[PDB]
Design a protein around this ligand. Sequence first.
Ligand SMILES: NC(=O)c1ccc[n+]([C@@H]2O[C@H](COP(=O)([O-])OP(=O)(O)OC[C@H]3O[C@@H](n4cnc5c(N)ncnc54)[C@H](OP(=O)(O)O)[C@@H]3O)[C@@H](O)[C@H]2O)c1
Length: 327
Amino acid sequence: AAAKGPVVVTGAAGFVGSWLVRKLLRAGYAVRATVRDPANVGKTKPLLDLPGAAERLSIWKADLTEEGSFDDAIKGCTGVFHVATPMDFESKDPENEVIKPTVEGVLSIMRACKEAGTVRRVVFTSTAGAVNVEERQKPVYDENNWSDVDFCRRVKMTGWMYFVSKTLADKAAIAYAAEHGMDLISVIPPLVIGPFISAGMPPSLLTALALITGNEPHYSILKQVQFVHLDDLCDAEIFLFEHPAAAGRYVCSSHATTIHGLAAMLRERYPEYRIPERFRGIDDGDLQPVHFSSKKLLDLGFAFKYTVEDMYDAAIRTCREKGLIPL
Ligand SMILES: NC(=O)c1ccc[n+]([C@@H]2O[C@H](COP(=O)([O-])OP(=O)(O)OC[C@H]3O[C@@H](n4cnc5c(N)ncnc54)[C@H](OP(=O)(O)O)[C@@H]3O)[C@@H](O)[C@H]2O)c1
């Protein structure tokens, strides 16, 4: 059996990327994993240790701020999964140090894909922050809703530079694709929870586990939150790449709840962990869930495998093997 056309995974050393490499290898693909520094044995070793990596995984050096650095890796590939994004949201010129670099990085990826000629489809990983960051929160969001970038630059909530970065990059990738007749899929995941291979806690699990720990600054994120299992997300990205009828934006969210609802589930499911009853910065009002509809993805025939219980069972375990207390 011949390896499925070589596909690139950008940011392969990361939380989402590394697991996507695992799943693409398992599905019979030759995977070209790109990282900013393949000489960093620490970050590269987990990838090379993956099942099937010896035969079908290769590591490539590339940087989103370095025009053309992805040309060699993409050349000859049938698909590109763009998961990398700049994550340094603590600068003093976010427009020029985060926003523009994020949009120029995605556009340069698209250019390299066009030049290659061999790429039939690009799968861009967006974020829920490109959908529902507006002044008036709606009860249901789908792939047709777009964050209000003007609103973000006005009130500058926590993480505003990231919402505008991804929202503008998402819009720019689509516009470039349509202008040059390219096949682009944009996948919108909420907070992603699941196993990780890095020795450090993924930033999404710091939020997900903020109730078990005492990570109070993350409480506002859990106020009205949506979840997806990392495995479901990666499987959906492979599904959407292989389905000939797939096109456009897709929401990949399997669970919506509130901080109060999440506290209850962890209370009944983990008596071993002390779950508070009240959370600073969050009143005792009426909180209803905000739903991210994945109808478009499910209509194509995709099905989620994991529940929110599966997610937290997997996160607590991997973390328990290091960065969190067993309490
Ligand atoms: N995890 C979630 O909950 C979540 C939710 C919604 C959307 N997403 C999106 O999923 C994608 C993955 O994020 P993540 O959770 O996996 O964070 P992450 O663990 O930090 O991985 C992201 C990758 O981006 C790479 N990167 C940053 N700047 C780069 C550059 N100039 N050139 C090449 N690579 C660069 C990082 O490599 P280095 O080690 O060299 O910095 C890093 O491996 C992002 O696009 C994110 O917006 C994630």
